[PDB]
């Protein structure tokens, strides 16, 4: 059902790469800092 903007811009020579760090790890870091402080 329909094409996403990702593939749409994909099929003309433009690509989007994913980040390195993820939201779960970011939340883990935040929780660790909060507990420590």
């Amino acid at each position: 059902a329909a094409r996403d903007l990702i593939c749409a811009q994909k099929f003309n020579g433009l690509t989007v790469l994913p980040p390195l760090l993820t939201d779960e790890m970011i939340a883990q870091y935040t929780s660790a800092l909060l507990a420590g402080t």
């Binding site: 094409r3 099929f11 003309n12 994913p18 980040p19 390195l20 760090l21 993820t22």
Partner: protein, 624 residues
């Protein structure tokens, strides 16, 4: 006298892993402590190279010369004097005879007259070619003459010269590096596609020695070269062998530190093409013109304007012979793709004697008096005799002939003049009399009239070229479609590449195309059956290389990006714009990630600190 023998043994092509042989200086430039890159016809490394053995026994086969020969000869006692090159090595064509004499060579590109085998009673019993002919280009100069000799010769014939890059290197193959130099440049400039090595055989019947030789070929390749403090080449690197070599070539270095690098791109390289087109509906009658029971008269030939049909010239050459389509401005096979407003077809009947009279700038009775043709007419003509039909038995006093007129006439008009002609000084008053004449006469055909006066129905298919969409252009064909494959398509003039699947979109009855917010086609209504399809072009992505430090090891890991490797080219020969380094899947631990999937690394349930970041919460390291 040319001799016979029956001593030969064969062998399938033996192979060795050609390590580092096939290098030569490509120019006359001097460099020091400089690294350079080149790209030309070259012998690939670590390639399977044929071994031919010649040792009674006797081997002088005919072998091709596709591009060039990498010739390595471990030989002694000079069992070979000279060689020959050419296109056919027969009498009719030119050939080359480069025979390295005892203290010379002779060259000549010219006609010969060959036996199958040369020799002398060392060839002055010149039965290379059993009869003497003239020759053009000759050259005489000083003699250019455990295994210890390694005769390496590269035969190149480009730019109209003979690039014998000859290296008398004094030596399987030695694992090392050794380049080679040009020696002679001679501008002959003929085809030369086949050659035969010639040898020197001396008697003890006849006697031959023992020798070995090899054959190689060159392909267009990109190479990297290294120069030491002097102008001597030390090492070379191929840029199409392995991903490590590709990384070295890209980074422009001989040592690579631990890291991750990008080399090239990747696409699907589609297969075949699809030409969907709509149907064909409208036809116009040619049977009514070519099969009329009562033809149009010579004076009242009918000028028919053609449109609102299709131009099925496909069925226009499907008539029996005698079709004088000495046509103007178009080929017959081409005809089906031209378009005109008004094809003013003319149809009259003329006795077969003067069929050639009606043509641009032609003379004759009807050509100067009845029907004079334009000198700028563009169109075809179809003629055929109607001796069987157009003449009736009991006396054809029904049909009529016309023979006369007053003066010349313009191109492209109908003349039906039947009036009295005023001939002399006396007036006519419109009646036959004093210098007066009435031109009309009838056929009166009995079955006896001869071939020249037998009818030949000439139809001048006058394609008058003007500006219309011209429904009558020519029939269009179509094919069958295949789904779920990388396909080039052309939908009623809309061309493109992609895959086609089903959909649920609801088009309006009068919409054909379909565009997204990005202003490009996404759906097409196929003409023959009124369905809806979704267009998705073929996938693609980049290529990244993962490797530890060169000082540590040599293994590498390769990553694909953004491609489900349920779809990675398992490949037949080439369906991968990655430079075809697919690896076996099961044992190499193919694992689907969120950044494509990886081939070459295994996965554990452990956890450590990150060494090399790959992406999306994953790392990699060279351990264990």
């Amino acid at each position: 006298q040319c001799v016979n023998l029956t001593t030969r043994t064969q062998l399938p092509p033996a192979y060795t892993n050609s390590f580092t042989r096939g290098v030569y200086y490509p120019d006359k430039v001097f460099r020091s402590s400089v690294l350079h890159s080149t790209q030309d016809l070259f012998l690939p490394f670590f390639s399977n190279v044929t071994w031919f053995h010649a040792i009674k026994r006797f081997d002088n086969p005919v072998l091709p010369f596709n591009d060039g020969v990498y010739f390595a000869s471990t030989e002694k006692s000079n069992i070979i004097r000279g060689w020959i090159f050419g296109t056919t090595l027969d009498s009719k064509t030119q050939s080359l005879l480069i025979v390295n004499n005892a203290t010379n060579v002779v060259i000549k590109v010219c006609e010969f007259q060959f036996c199958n085998d040369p020799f002398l009673g060392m060839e002055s019993e010149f039965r290379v070619y059993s009869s003497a002919n003239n020759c053009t280009f000759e050259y005489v100069s000083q003699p250019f003459l455990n295994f210890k000799n390694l005769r390496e010769f590269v035969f190149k014939n480009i730019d109209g010269y003979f690039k014998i890059y000859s290296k008398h290197t004094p030596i399987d193959l030695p694992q090392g590096f050794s380049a080679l130099e040009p020696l002679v440049d001679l501008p002959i400039g003929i085809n030369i596609t086949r050659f035969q090595t010639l040898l020197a055989l001396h008697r003890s019947g006849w006697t031959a020695g023992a020798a070995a030789y090899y054959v190689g070929y060159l392909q267009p390749r990109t190479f990297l070269l290294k120069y030491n403090e002097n102008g001597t080449i030390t090492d070379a690197v191929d840029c199409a062998l392995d991903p490590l070599s590709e990384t070295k070539c890209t980074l422009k270095s001989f040592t690579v530190e631990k890291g991750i690098y990008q080399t090239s791109n990747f696409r699907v390289q589609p297969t075949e093409s699809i030409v969907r087109f709509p149907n064909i509906t409208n036809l116009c009658p040619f049977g009514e013109v070519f099969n009329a029971t009562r033809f149009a008269s010579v004076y009242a030939w009918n000028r028919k304007r053609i449109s609102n049909c299709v131009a099925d010239y496909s069925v226009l050459y499907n008539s029996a012979s005698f079709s004088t389509f000495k046509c103007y401005g178009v080929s017959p096979t081409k005809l089906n793709d031209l378009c005109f407003t008004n094809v003013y077809a003319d149809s009259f009947v003329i006795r077969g004697d003067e069929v050639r009279q009606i043509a641009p700038g032609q003379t004759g009775k009807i050509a100067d008096y009845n029907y004079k043709l334009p000198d700028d007419f563009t169109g075809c003509v179809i003629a055929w005799n109607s001796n069987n039909l157009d003449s009736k038995v009991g006396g054809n006093y029904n049909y009529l002939f016309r023979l006369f007129r007053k003066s010349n006439l313009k191109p492209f008009e109908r003349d039906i003049s039947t009036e009295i002609y005023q001939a002399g000084s006396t007036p006519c008053n419109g009646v036959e009399g004093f210098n007066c004449y009435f031109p009309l006469q009838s056929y009166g055909f009995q079955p006896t009239n001869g071939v020249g006066y037998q009818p030949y129905r000439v139809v001048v298919l006058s394609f008058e070229l003007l500006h219309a969409p011209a429904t009558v252009c020519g029939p269009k064909k179509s094919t069958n479609l295949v789904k779920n494959k990388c396909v080039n398509f052309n939908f009623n003039g809309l061309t493109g590449t992609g895959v086609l699947t089903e959909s649920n979109k609801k088009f309006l009855p009068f919409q054909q195309f379909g565009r997204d917010i990005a202003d490009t086609t996404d759906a097409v209504r196929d003409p023959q059956t009124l369905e809806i399809l979704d267009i998705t072009p073929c996938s693609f992505g980049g290529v990244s290389v993962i490797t530890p430090g060169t000082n540590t090891s040599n293994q590498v890991a390769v990553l694909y990006q953004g491609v489900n490797c349920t779809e990675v080219p398992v490949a037949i020969h080439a369906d991968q714009l990655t430079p075809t380094w697919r690896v076996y899947s099961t044992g190499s631990n193919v694992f689907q990630t969120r950044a494509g999937c990886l081939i070459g690394a295994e996965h554990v349930n452990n956890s450590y600190e990150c060494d090399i970041p790959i992406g999306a919460g994953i790392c990699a390291s060279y351990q264990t």
